[PDB]
Design a protein around this ligand. Structure first.
Ligand SMILES: NCc1ccc(C(=O)N2C[C@@H](n3cc(C4CC4)nn3)C[C@H]2C(=O)NCC(c2ccccc2)c2ccccc2)cc1
Ligand SMILES: [Ca+2]
Length: 223
């Protein structure tokens, strides 16, 4: 997250860290046994880390649970990033409490202008590289589909939305992908892609979660 703020320990209780020996992606806990992340975060040997603040220090509220199964969306296209969503089933149910909690799925899609919270452990610089140890947060509005398409001609599908600031300076960045975009207590987006970070006219692009609620619910109900 570039131009954000320190969230505060365990204030984003649905945020998880995907670890394969090191943090590589965010995710969102949607029930005691399932996490939503980006399909581009797929890899073997994922350990889901819940209740994290400083990802380099064991602080006392963590739960580390291996993934038993990963399900990438059947229509994910890694060249276009269309349908950039995946489900991860935990080997065991997380113990839910105030600091490790699920996030509700949207019923309804969120409009341009809706304010959201984006969080992650990604790079905090737009030029240069600095990876924080603690969770960073950014409040950002959903942008109109027309401004999103004008920023990225020929690349925004009906399964994507932009959020952020066209003036730049505040955005998600490398290491934040797979993480949550929450609006009014609902998971509306997944950090997906963008052209660099925090650059003018290049806002972040997010997977539109509301389009996947039927697939998420059916997949969990069966797996
Ligand atoms: N400003 C918007 C914006 C927001 C988020 C991103 C972003 O995070 N992004 C952009 C993401 N992404 C993936 C792709 C297509 C190839 C499929 N295009 N864009 C990838 C992630 C990143 O770079 N994360 C660093 C992370 C990694 C995880 C999965 C795949 C690739 C890289 C990594 C790798 C190795 C070690 C540690 C971490 C990029 C831009
Ligand atoms: Ca920790």
């Amino acid at each position: 997250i570039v131009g954000g703020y320190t969230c505060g320990a365990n204030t984003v209780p649905y945020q998880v860290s995907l670890n394969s020996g090191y943090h590589f992606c965010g995710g969102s806990l949607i029930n005691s046994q399932w996490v939503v992340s980006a399909a581009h975060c797929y890899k073997s040997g994922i350990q889901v880390r819940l209740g994290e603040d400083n990802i380099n220090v064991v602080e006392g509220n963590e739960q580390f649970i291996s993934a038993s199964k990963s399900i990438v969306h059947p229509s994910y296209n890694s060249n276009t990033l269309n349908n950039d969503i995946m489900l991860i089933k935990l080997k065991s149910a997380a113990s839910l409490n105030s600091r490790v909690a699920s996030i509700s799925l949207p019923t309804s899609c969120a409009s341009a202008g809706t304010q959201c919270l984006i969080s992650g452990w990604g790079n905090t610089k737009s030029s240069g590289t600095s990876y924080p140890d603690v969770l960073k947060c950014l409040k950002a509005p959903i942008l109109s589909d027309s401004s999103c398409k004008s920023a990225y001609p020929g690349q925004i599908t009906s399964n994507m939305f932009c959020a952020g600031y066209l003036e730049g300076g505040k955005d998600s960045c490398q290491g934040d992908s797979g993480g949550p975009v929450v609006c009014s207590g609902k998971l509306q987006g997944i950090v997906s892609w963008g052209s660099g970070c925090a650059q003018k006219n290049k806002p972040g692009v997010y997977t539109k979660v509301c389009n996947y609620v039927s697939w998420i619910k059916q997949t969990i109900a069966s797996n």
